[PDB]
Amino acid sequence: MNIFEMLRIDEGLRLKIYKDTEGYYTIGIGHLLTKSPSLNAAKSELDKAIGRNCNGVITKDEAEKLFNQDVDAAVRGILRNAKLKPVYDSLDAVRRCALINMVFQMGETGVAGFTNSLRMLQQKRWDEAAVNLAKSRWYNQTPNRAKRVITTFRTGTWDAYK
Numbered sequence: 001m002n003i004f005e006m007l008r009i010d011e012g013l014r015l016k017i018y019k020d021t022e023g024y025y026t027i028g029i030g031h032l033l034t035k036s037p038s039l040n041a042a043k044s045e046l047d048k049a050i051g052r053n054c055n056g057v058i059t060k061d062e063a064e065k066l067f068n069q070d071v072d073a074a075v076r077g078i079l080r081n082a083k084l085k086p087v088y089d090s091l092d093a094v095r096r097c098a099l100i101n102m103v104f105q106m107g108e109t110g111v112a113g114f115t116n117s118l119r120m121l122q123q124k125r126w127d128e129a130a131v132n133l134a135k136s137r138w139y140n141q142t143p144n145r146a147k148r149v150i151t152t153f154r155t156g157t158w159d160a161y162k
C-alpha cells in the first residue's frame with residue numbers, strides 16, 4: 001500500500017465538477033478548484049488547471065496528472081515547512097504517509113495548527129496523539145476518514161485501509 005492508493009481510497013475519483021464535503025468545487029482525486037460559490041469560477045479554474053476547455057469534465061488521465069501534482073506539492077510543502085519538516089523527519093514511513101494525507105486534505109497551514117498533536121507525534125506518544133487529533137473539527141466533520149488516518153498514526157500499519 002502506498003500514498004497514492006491511500007489517498008485514492010479516501011478521496012474517490014470523480015470525472016465531473018463536484019462539491020466536496022464542505023461544499024467547495026472539486027474535480028478528480030480531491031483536487032479543490034475554488035472556494036468561490038460560483039460554478040463559473042470553477043469551470044474557469046478547471047480550464048486554467050488543464051490548459052484547455054473542459055467545460056466541467058475531465059478524463060481519468062487528466063485526473064491522475066493533477067493527482068501526481070498535488071501529492072508532489074504536499075510532500076514539498078511539508079519539507080519546506082519549519083513546523084512540519086521536523087515531525088516528518090522523525091517519523092517512520094507509514095506514519096509519514098498519514099501526515100501527507102492530512103496535508104493534502106487540509107493544507108499545510110491547517111496541519112501546522114495542530115501544535116499539541118504534532119508535538120506528541122514527534123515524541124512518539126501514539127495513544128496520546130490519537131486522543132488529541134480526535135478533538136478537532138476535522139474529526140467531527142469527516143469521522144471515518146479521520147479514524148482511518150488516526151489509526152495509521154496510532155499503529156504504524158496499513159490496517160485501517162485493509
Ligand SMILES: [Cl-]
Pocket residue numbers: 049
Ligand atoms: Cl493546478
Ligand SMILES: [Cl-]
Pocket residue numbers: 141142143144145146
Ligand atoms: Cl468521513
